[PDB]
């Protein structure tokens, strides 16, 4: 669950923005790219 | 999954009934009635009175009949 983006500008608080970056730490999905394992073998 | 069995039974105090199972033996034909019939939460109501195998070569015959009556109620 990436946190809710349907919010007023006041309810996008400092903890709400911090919760967005913490979702990036828990990790790509793309269906027109190859995998990272594939492109590193090519490199 | 060997033979077919038509049963006549008696739900106790509620009415009469007809059933038909597929089981190996009539001990398992009574098992599937008491465990998969509609009286599954009150399975002591089933009183099976007659189990008889569906043998074919007549190919035309009655197997079960049980009329509830205005005087039995």
């Amino acid at each position: 669950n990436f946190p809710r983006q349907m919010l007023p500008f006041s309810k996008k608080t400092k903890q709400w923005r911090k919760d967005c970056l913490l979702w990036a730490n828990q990790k790509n999905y793309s269906l027109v790219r190859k995998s990272v394992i594939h492109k590193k073998i090519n490199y | 999954a060997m033979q077919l069995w038509v049963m006549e039974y008696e739900v106790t105090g509620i009415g009469k009934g007809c059933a038909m199972c597929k089981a190996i033996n009539p001990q398992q034909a009574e098992m599937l009635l008491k465990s998969n019939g509609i009286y599954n939460g009150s399975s002591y109501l089933y009183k099976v009175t007659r189990i008889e195998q569906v043998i074919v070569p007549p190919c035309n015959g009655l197997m079960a009949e049980q009329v509830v009556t205005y005087k039995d109620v």
Binding site: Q5, M6, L7, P8, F9, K12, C20, L21, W23, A24, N25 | -
Partner: protein, 38 residues
């Protein structure tokens, strides 16, 4: 030998940057020009 994103690697730090499109509520307003009826 041997017979994962750390915070550090060879003294360097780990910088992870997230860019995302969030949903902003805005108003569309229909007003009239005072000079001409537009």
């Amino acid at each position: 030998f041997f017979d994962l994103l750390p915070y550090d690697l060879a003294g360097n730090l780990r910088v992870l940057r997230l860019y995302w499109k969030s949903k902003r509520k805005i108003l569309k307003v229909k007003s009239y020009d005072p000079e001409t009826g537009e």
